Structure 1
Amino acid sequence: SPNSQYLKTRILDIYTPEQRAGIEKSEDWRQFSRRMDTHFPKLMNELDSVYGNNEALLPMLEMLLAQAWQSYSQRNSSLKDIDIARENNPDWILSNKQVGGVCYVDLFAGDLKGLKDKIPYFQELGLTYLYLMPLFKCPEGKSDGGYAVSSYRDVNPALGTIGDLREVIAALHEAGISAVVDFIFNHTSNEHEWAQRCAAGDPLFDNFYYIFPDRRMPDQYDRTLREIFPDQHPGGFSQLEDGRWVWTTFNSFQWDLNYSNPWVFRAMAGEMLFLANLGVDILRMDAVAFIWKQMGTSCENLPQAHALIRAFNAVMRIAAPAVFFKSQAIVHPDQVVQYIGQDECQIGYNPLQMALLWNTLATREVNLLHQALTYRHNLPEHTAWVNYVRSHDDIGWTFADEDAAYLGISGYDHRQFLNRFFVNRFDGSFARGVPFQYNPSTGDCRVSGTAAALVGLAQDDPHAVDRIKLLYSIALSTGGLPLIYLGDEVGTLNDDDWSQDSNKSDDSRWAHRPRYNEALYAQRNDPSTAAGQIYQGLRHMIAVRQSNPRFDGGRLVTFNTNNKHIIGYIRNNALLAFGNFSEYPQTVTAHTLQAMPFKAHDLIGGKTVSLNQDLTLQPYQVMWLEIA
């Protein structure tokens, strides 16, 4: 295995003796050289555990590092100042000052020029993080909402140009907002240049995807493969016009990239460097679970998958230190947490808390949520959770069956109930969601629908507004970076005409991806409307989170409320949070509150509450008590 000093002299070999002496004395090389010495051993070690003694490893590594230097040299100085800042402040993600938001540029603002006009609103809401959905070129028609990339360099013409994106990112930075986008790396479209060339037999793009001659290997892999979209195709394979079969974990038009080929890592690390120099602060690493395949296994969460992410991390620590990663792993809780590490993905989605928030709204019992917050919330140093209520995706009931079994709950039967409840197929249900990917072969099903539709705002349930304020309060105060699905702050309902659209009809996720509702946003300052009650309710919680230091960090200690309907947790041994998940008044007795001080100020309602007597919480009431 080669060292950092050796490879650095090979990088400088492209320069003539006269200009080489000039680069060695420059500030850009002094920083790159320091970061190479510190972070290259990790890059070498991770790439070695995956590729081993591959002939292509050394030539790939040298090509990658040469490209990494050119990328850091070309990098803007304003971005180099953010590199220095975050290199010396790894806990910026754990700060209570951070509140995030997510939206589709076309649905929320039309185009990129329209999005920069929406920036004063993001500042009004108090956002310091903005996640933009797939901006790059995708095929016309079905593209999985932009998740089938045809070109990582060209922006979708309907949204604008590559220059318009640089202007948006710079305008976000001036407003004190971090730019977050997707790094669609597990797969590309079947219309991508690499895809067409690999299938055509071009030797430069050989083994870039997993192409098989018949059903022999696909049948053997399918014995252990989980179906993500069973409505589209069985297993994880799709057929071409010539008779060959290709690995398609998702849609038929989304072909899985082959990370067993060292050249695919290089190709994708080059695409990462491009995104880094645009000014992107955090990259969303979707489908991190599927980047490595092996016969006999589920081809999910394999050791080499984690090692490849850690290798990508090292490329960033060397050529763009400001670029952090956000893991999206909608898998078993034991596997979700393994992607989170300072040397892997610094932040990651929290599907467990999210799914259990909805479960608790259905059952009215906090048992599962309490268990999750007590045993699975705390993370290692320099890492944070991305807590959310809703996303562009469906809700999967990804709680642990083993955790549920300890509480006397059968995982299969509980998911049967939750799915029936949330799609309005259970008596007295307030939820108005629609099914997504019902698999008759497994009994598994996911739920589509906005936060407002699932709490009952569509039929004007009087408890609906309070339910949204309750779910968001947990995401905003548990510890981690909260991500608001833009449109939820005004109670936006489902898109009614998704089902009668040929390009959207086979994907129920479009029910929860509606356009910017002008009418609801114009009612945001009116306390008499549902939209105004939700906005002012959420805005108050955001204001309190950002100004009060008691919410700092990602750590928590749960509090036993002795009431199965009320959740309780303590932040920094100074903030006691209570959340009633029942539609009836619930009580935390004087007995349970004996250790707490006599009086405590509530940050939600503003009243001074006595804890020396019985505390009765109103239907879906949230209380943030200052106990120190």
Structure 2
Amino acid sequence: SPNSQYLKTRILDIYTPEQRAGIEKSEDWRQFSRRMDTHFPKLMNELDSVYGNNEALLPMLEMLLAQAWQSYSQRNSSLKDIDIARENNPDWILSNKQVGGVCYVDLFAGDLKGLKDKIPYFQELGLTYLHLMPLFKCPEGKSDGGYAVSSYRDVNPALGTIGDLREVIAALHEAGISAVVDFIFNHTSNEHEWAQRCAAGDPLFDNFYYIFPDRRMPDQYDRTLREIFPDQHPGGFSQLEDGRWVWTTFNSFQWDLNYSNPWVFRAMAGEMLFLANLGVDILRMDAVAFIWKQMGTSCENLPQAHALIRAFNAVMRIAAPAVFFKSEAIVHPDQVVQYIGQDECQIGYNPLQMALLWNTLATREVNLLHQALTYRHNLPEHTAWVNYVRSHDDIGWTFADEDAAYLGISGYDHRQFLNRFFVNRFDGSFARGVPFQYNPSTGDCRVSGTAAALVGLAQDDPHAVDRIKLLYSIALSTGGLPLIYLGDEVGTLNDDDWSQDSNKSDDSRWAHRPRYNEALYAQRNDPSTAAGQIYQDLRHMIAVRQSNPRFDGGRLVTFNTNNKHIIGYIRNNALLAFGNFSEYPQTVTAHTLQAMPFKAHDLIGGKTVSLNQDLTLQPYQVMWLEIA
């Protein structure tokens, strides 16, 4: 394997003797050279573990390093300052000062210029992180909400131009908000130039995707593949007009990129550098679990997938240190955490906590949630969870069957209950969600619907507002970076037209992708409305989280409340949080509280609470007690 010093001498060979002398003395080269020596070993080791003695490895690597140097040289000075700032502050992601939000540019603000006008509101709310949904060119009509990319460089004309995107990012940074965008690297749309050229037989794009002559291999692979969108097609393949079959894990118009080809890694690394230089702070690594395939396996979470992500990480440490990764791995808990690491994805979605928050609202019992917070919350140094209540996607019940069995709970039976409950097919349920991808062959199913729709706000359930407060309180205080699905802060309900829209009717996820509700946002300062109650309560919790150091970091220790309806945990051995998941008053006995201070201030309600006597919580009440 080649070493950093040797490879750098070749990077400089493009310069004449005179130019070379100047480059070698430049500050940019000095920084690039230093980072190469420190991080190149990791890049080489990761690529070697995947490609081994592949003849294309060396040539691909040298091409990638040459591009990395040009990219860093071009990188704006202001971004280079952020690179240095984060190099020496790896835990910026763990600060309690961080609070994020996510929204679709078109649905929330019309276009990029409109989004820019919403920045003052984001500052009003207290956001320091903003994830904008897929912004680039995609197929007209059906594109999986922009996740079928037809071009990684051209902005969706309905949203604006690449110039408008630069202005937006600059404006976000000026307002103290980090820009977060998707890195859709597992697949492209079937209309992407690479796909068209690969399928046409262009040698330059040979083996950029997985294309087969017939069903022989597809049938073999399908013996172990999980269906993500069973409604769209069976297994993981789709047939082309000419009769061939292509690997399509998701929709048929999304073709999986072939990472067994080193040139594909180089191509996508180039796209990552492009996004990095636009000023993006965090890249959401979409579908990380699926980037490596192997016959006889589920083609999910394979070793090479992790290695490739660690290789991408090293490229950023060398050419754009400020860029961090957010892993999107909605899989088994044992597998979710394997993507999180300082050298892989520094942060990642926490689907287990999210799914269990909803589980607990339905069952009124905190058993599973307590178990998860006790054994699966703490992470390695310099990494953090992204805690959320809802997202642009459906809710999947990804808790571990093994964990549940230990509590005497049957995974399959329990998911049946949760699905029926949340789609209003269970006596007395307050939820008004909609089914997503019910699979007749497996019995699995997911749930669509906004947070407000799922807690009963559509029918004005008197407990709805308090349920929303409880859910968000936990994502905001357990430790990690909380992500608010914009619109939830004013109680936005399901979209009213998706079910009859021919481009959306077969994808219920659109039920929870409503447009900015002018009426509700105009009521956010009125305490007599649901919108005003939800907004002021969430804003208050955000204010407390960001100003109180007791919430800093991502570690927690659970507290046994001795009441199956009340969750309890402690942050920094100084903040005791209690959350009542019952619609009835619930008590934490004085006996249980004997070791606590006699009195403690509650940050939620603002009153002083006595802990040397029975503590009774009202339905869905949350308490944030300062015990130190």
Normalising to structure 1: TM-score of the pair?
1.00
Structure 1: unaligned runs, 5 residues or longer? none
Q: Which runs of structure 2 are paired with 1:456-475 in the superposition (5 Å)?
A: 456-475=456-475
Q: Deviations over 1:430-479 (max 9, x none)?
A: 00000000000000000000000000000000000000000000000000
Structure 2: unaligned runs, 5 residues or longer? none
CA distance in 2, matches of 1:626, 1:425: 41
Q: Deviations over 1:381-425 (max 9, x none)?
A: 000000000000000000000000000000000000000000000
Q: Deviations over 1:167-200 (max 9, x none)?
A: 0001000100000000000000000000000000
CA distance in 2, matches of 1:145, 1:288: 18
SS of corresponding position for 1:524: coil
Deviation, structure 1 residue 237? 0.2
Deviation, structure 1 residue 496? 1.6
Tell me if 1:149 matches 2:149.
yes
Tell me if 1:406 matches 2:406.
yes
2:62 is aligned to 62
CA distance in 1, matches of 2:607, 2:18: 73
1:333 is aligned to 333
CA distance in 1, matches of 2:200, 2:120: 49
CA distance in 2, matches of 1:130, 1:232: 31
SS of corresponding position for 2:285: strand
CA distance in 2, matches of 1:496, 1:328: 28
CA distance in 2, matches of 1:613, 1:223: 60
CA distance in 2, matches of 1:592, 1:57: 62
Tell me if 1:178 matches 2:178.
yes
CA distance in 2, matches of 1:503, 1:615: 52
Deviation, structure 1 residue 140? 0.6
Q: Deviations over 1:325-376 (max 9, x none)?
A: 0000000000000000000000000000000000000000000000000000
Question: % of aligned pairs identical?
Answer: 100
SS of corresponding position for 1:24: helix
CA distance in 2, matches of 1:506, 1:433: 15
CA distance in 2, matches of 1:409, 1:434: 25
Deviation, structure 1 residue 482? 0.1
Q: Deviations over 1:225-258 (max 9, x none)?
A: 0000000000000000000000000000000000
SS of corresponding position for 1:2: coil
1:528 is aligned to 528
Deviation, structure 1 residue 286? 1.1
Q: Which runs of structure 2 are paired with 1:29-40 in the superposition (5 Å)?
A: 29-40=29-40
CA distance in 1, matches of 2:211, 2:353: 38
Deviation, structure 1 residue 605? 0.2
SS of corresponding position for 2:535: helix
Deviation, structure 1 residue 589? 0.1
Aligned length: 628
CA distance in 2, matches of 1:82, 1:170: 13
SS of corresponding position for 2:499: coil
SS of corresponding position for 2:387: strand
CA distance in 2, matches of 1:170, 1:595: 51
CA distance in 2, matches of 1:499, 1:557: 44
RMSD: 0.2
Deviation, structure 1 residue 497? 1.0
SS of corresponding position for 2:154: strand
CA distance in 2, matches of 1:93, 1:232: 37
CA distance in 2, matches of 1:233, 1:102: 29
Q: Deviations over 1:69-114 (max 9, x none)?
A: 0000000000000000000000000000000000000000000000
CA distance in 1, matches of 2:237, 2:19: 52
CA distance in 2, matches of 1:246, 1:400: 32
Normalising to structure 2: TM-score of the pair?
1.00
* Runs of 4+ with deviation above 4 angstroms: none
1:260 is aligned to 260
2:482 is aligned to 482
SS of corresponding position for 2:188: strand
2:499 is aligned to 499
CA distance in 1, matches of 2:27, 2:117: 37
Deviation, structure 1 residue 575? 0.1
CA distance in 1, matches of 2:294, 2:483: 34
Q: Deviations over 1:521-558 (max 9, x none)?
A: 00000000000000000000000000000000000000
1:383 is aligned to 383
Deviation, structure 1 residue 57? 0.0
CA distance in 2, matches of 1:265, 1:71: 17
SS of corresponding position for 1:151: coil
CA distance in 2, matches of 1:515, 1:362: 27
Deviation, structure 1 residue 590? 0.2
SS of corresponding position for 1:121: helix
